Structures are given as C-alpha cells and as structure tokens.
Ligand binder design. Sequence first.
Ligand SMILES: [Cl-]
Ligand SMILES: [Cl-]
Ligand SMILES: [Cl-]
Length: 190
Amino acid sequence: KYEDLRAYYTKPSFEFEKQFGFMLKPWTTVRFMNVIPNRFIYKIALVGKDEKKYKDGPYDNIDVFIVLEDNKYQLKKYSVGGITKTNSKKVNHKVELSITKKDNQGMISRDVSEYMITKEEISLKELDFKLRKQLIEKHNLYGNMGSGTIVIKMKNGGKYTFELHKKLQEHRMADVIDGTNIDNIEVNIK
Ligand SMILES: [Cl-]
Ligand SMILES: [Cl-]
Ligand SMILES: [Cl-]
C-alpha cells in the first residue's frame, strides 16, 4: 500500500549552499531555476510562492535542497521547490523531535531525539523529506503503518502539518519558514 511513498522518501537528496541561480529559455509551462554546483545542471521548478518570488534573475546566494523527481515522460531530471536564501550567520538551533507511534497492534510507543536546524530560512520540502526518511529508517514508516502527521510547531503557536498518507503537496515544497522560530517537532504515526 505504501510502496510509492517509501520509494520516494528514501530517494537520495542533494543540498548545496551559496549557489548562483539562473533562468534559461523555458522548456515547459512551469519555470525553472538552474544551479551548477559542480558540472551537472540542476533544474528546480518554481511552484507555489516561488512563481511570484523569482523572475528573470540571476539570483546569487541561494541554498537548494534537491530531490530528483520520477517522470517517465520527461528526459530532463528536475527537482521541485526547496529554494531558500543562504545563511547570513551560522545557525545551530537544536529542537526536540518527539515520535509517538501506534502500531498495527494498537500498541502506543513514544520516543525522542534532537534535530539540528542549521538554516535561518528552511523549506518545508527539506523538513518533510528528511523527517520522513528518518522515520522510514528508524521507525519503519511505510512498513506497516503509513498515516498520521509530522507537525512543525512554531514559537508563535503556529503549526505546519505534513500528512503522512500522501506526498507533500507540490506547492508547499516552495514554502519557506524561519528555522530559528521552530519550537519543536512532533510526529504521530498511526
Ligand atoms: Cl526519527
Ligand atoms: Cl514564529
Ligand atoms: Cl509560508
């Protein structure tokens, strides 16, 4: 049942900082930012709030969190969202990650760890992806259980919720938040 999710959220990810973003002739109706950290051009789709945010550029000093999408019908490999402004100063903002899990036998277990935030501005894409990957690896998410929530709890009381039974909505992969205003992170698997 959860094979597609497990496959997607165990893909490798790539992260680069202080990149030079540029725009080319568009090759679809969605616009893209391009970065070349090494010799491979990463193409990043501009969705959600990013469509308004970036016009022709170029855009220096951006960080990117990249996951290459499966699209059988596009030869170009691309990622979606995950663009942020690079740090102005170094950040080490340690937050509590609590994990409550009710397994297929209804047994409730509770665990805790700490999650190091290193970015002033961080995409929901990166938090969603890295957290689900950690959950798959350490708590067998998408093994027997594949529903519930990840909740990023902010210092003003606000919440960003990722529902585990489906992929993060595409537009939300462009949403960015203040990494240092993250109060804690709560996972509830069922
Ligand atoms: Cl975890
Ligand atoms: Cl806040
Ligand atoms: Cl937002």
